[PDB]
Structure 1
């Protein structure tokens, strides 16, 4: 730590000791059902963009490796998460939103986009965490005579708020003369047709779009992926996995009075101080296991290679990663004598150390 082969007399802060974790604990809710992703990604007909269908997924175990088997897409484009880490952690509820657009408007299915679909049909919020899945459907949602079964809304009074729907079909008016239900001069129907043909270009093909919307855990978790639980131990520094969040610390029984809607407890530095176990409705205090600072007390290497080690701030019945107890920690390797001299190496609250003949050894004194 000094980048030198010879050290001088004094006390040096070298490193920190940390108690390593022994076991691992995974605590997940006891859920045995399977999530209906096959009925979402494999359907005969999907709904129109202005009337998009929302499916609520809950009380099941979700495996995301079958999504590639169910549908022939390329990119599993997620925003708040990653595709490869979806099977480890878990959420409260998952929503699936299904519609068919053209190839030009796939880029508008994104947080912070404007246009036709993103402003009048389907708007994503700015803090959207989830994945957007899009794939070509020229062999299913196209006809040689023109597919008119899918409609889009291009005329509206105002922009659409996130996750809103508009199903009402009224004659849009853009002038002072009222339409009064008659599509005449300055009157247009807001529902226009895609008109899908297989002879169109690659940017005009139908695209089947499924939007998976995850919400982070605030309520006790109803959907969680495939992971076997582990029995709970206490009063040991372990690695825990409580409903998707990891960490290292010591779990003890807690005297905190949680309200029944509360599942966690945070500290001032925004760290999970207390946790609620998902299997048994029990409150557990999380505290990190023992640590501290280590100071090495030495004379020069010209004098001797003997050292004394001060474990700073700890009460060393808890020492490991003569023995004398100071108020700066406790001292290992120096023998406390009942004599007083001038200070040579300052240790702590009135305690010094020196190298004295009376064989040579390191002594500590006041």
Structure 2
């Protein structure tokens, strides 16, 4: 700590002590069924861009390491999460929207994106926590006449809201012609289909963009699974994997009135304080176990080499990862004495220490406030001195420190 080899006589702060976690527990809800991640990926065709289908997935094994080779794509455009540790999570629901777009607006499928096809057929929220899986469809969806099945809207009176579907057919009234149902001149309908070819250009070949909703840290969780559930312990420092939450705690039991819909609990600073067990509905508080720090009480290195150790503000029933106990904590390596000496090293709340021979030992004691006096007082009791002492007492005062001028360019950059 001192970054030296000689140590002066005093008390020195040292890095904290913590209790190592003993076991690791995993408590996942007992779900065993399977859901078609596969069958919605090698399908015959997908829905249109303006009529994108949203399907609900619940109560199945959440395996994301298998969609790598269920679909021939090239990596993930994940926002908020990552595909590497996606299988370690546990959340409420997943929705797989899918549509077939042109190639030069895969970059237009992003939160906070403005464009023609960003706001007229499909729009993302401002904070989208999901992944934007996309791959080509040069072999599966390509026709010599053209792909006239897919439709995209060119004209709308207002931009779309995020995650809302507008399926309709009508006649746009930008022009002044009152056709009111005729798709002739000057009131052209927005039902127009882009066409491709097998011998078409490569820069905007059609895609098969699939997004994932991934709502998390809310509600009971029912799309999880790919690990083994273990047992549970109480009042021991263990690691817990309650759904998605990870930490070290003792898992005490308390009396907190759960509403039937609530599945989490936070105290002040988004720190999780009570987790309902996914298997059985009960109480489980979360509390990381004992802590503090160590303070080294030593004389000089030239004087001795023995030390006295303080543990900060804790009953020392569990010392590791004689004994004198005070409100500042226990002391191992120090022996209490009932005397009162003018103390050298402050130790804690009310106690000091020194170095006395009575082999030399590191004693600790309650602080002497000076020698106790019983100074007399009556109606006739006065002390008048008959002699003095002209004493010279040296008082030392700083006046100025070193004048330092720092060259900002030379220090930061170095010519």
TM-score interval for Structure 1 and Structure 2 normalised by the shorter chain: over 0.9
* Rounded Cα–Cα distance in structure 2 between residues aligned with 1:22 and 1:49: 53
**Offset, 1:358:** 1.4
**Offset, 1:131:** 1.0
Q: What is the correspondence of 1:9-158 to structure 2 with a 5 Å cutoff?
A: 9-158=9-158
1:89/1:225 contact within 8 Å kept? no
2:49/2:152 contact within 8 Å kept? yes
Secondary structure in 2 matching 1:97: strand
Count of equivalent residues: 366
Q: Which moved more, 1:338-347 or 1:179-188?
A: 179-188
**Offset, 1:91:** 1.5
2:31/2:225 contact within 8 Å kept? no
* Rounded Cα–Cα distance in structure 2 between residues aligned with 1:94 and 1:205: 28
**Offset, 1:173:** 0.9
**Offset, 1:69:** 2.0
**Offset, 1:312:** 1.3
Q: Which moved more, 1:337-346 or 1:198-207?
A: 198-207
Structure 1 residues 65, 348: CA separation in 2 closer, same or farther (over 3 Å shift)? Answer: closer
**Offset, 1:68:** 2.3
Structure with greater strand share of residues: 1
Q: Which moved more, 1:154-163 or 1:74-83?
A: 74-83
Question: Residue 318 of structure 1 corresponds to which residue in structure 2?
Answer: 318
**Offset, 1:318:** 2.7
TM-score norm. by structure 2 comes to 0.86
Between 1 and 2, higher relative CO (CA 8 Å, sep ≥ 6) is seen in: 1
* Rounded Cα–Cα distance in structure 1 between residues aligned with 2:351 and 2:70: 73
TM-score norm. by structure 1 comes to 0.97
1:102/1:203 contact within 8 Å kept? no
Please list the CA deviations of residues 176-210 of structure 1 after superposition, one character each: whole Å capped at 9, or x if unmatched: 44331112332011111111211211123111111
1:141/1:196 contact within 8 Å kept? no
* Rounded Cα–Cα distance in structure 2 between residues aligned with 1:266 and 1:24: 22
Please list the CA deviations of residues 66-119 of structure 1 after superposition, one character each: whole Å capped at 9, or x if unmatched: 212222111222111001111111211000111101111111111111112211
* Rounded Cα–Cα distance in structure 1 between residues aligned with 2:95 and 2:136: 22
Secondary structure in 1 matching 2:246: strand
**Offset, 1:351:** 1.2
Please list the CA deviations of residues 293-340 of structure 1 after superposition, one character each: whole Å capped at 9, or x if unmatched: 211100001110011111110111232221111221111111111111
2:41/2:70 contact within 8 Å kept? yes
2:177/2:187 contact within 8 Å kept? no
* Rounded Cα–Cα distance in structure 2 between residues aligned with 1:337 and 1:178: 106
* Rounded Cα–Cα distance in structure 1 between residues aligned with 2:38 and 2:186: 46
1:153/1:191 contact within 8 Å kept? yes
Secondary structure in 2 matching 1:182: coil
Structure 2: tracts of 5 or more residues without a match:
367-415
Structure 1: tracts of 5 or more residues without a match:
none
**Offset, 1:45:** 1.0
Q: Which moved more, 1:251-260 or 1:203-212?
A: 203-212
Q: Which of 1 and 2 has greater Rg?
A: 2
Q: Which moved more, 1:30-39 or 1:177-186?
A: 177-186
How big is the alpha-carbon RMSD for the aligned residues of Structure 1 and Structure 2?
1.2
**Offset, 1:49:** 0.5
* Rounded Cα–Cα distance in structure 1 between residues aligned with 2:332 and 2:55: 65
Please list the CA deviations of residues 112-155 of structure 1 after superposition, one character each: whole Å capped at 9, or x if unmatched: 11112211000010111111111111122111122211111110
* Rounded Cα–Cα distance in structure 2 between residues aligned with 1:68 and 1:3: 52
**Offset, 1:14:** 1.1
**Offset, 1:225:** 3.6
Q: What is the correspondence of 1:1-366 to structure 2 with a 5 Å cutoff?
A: 1-366=1-366
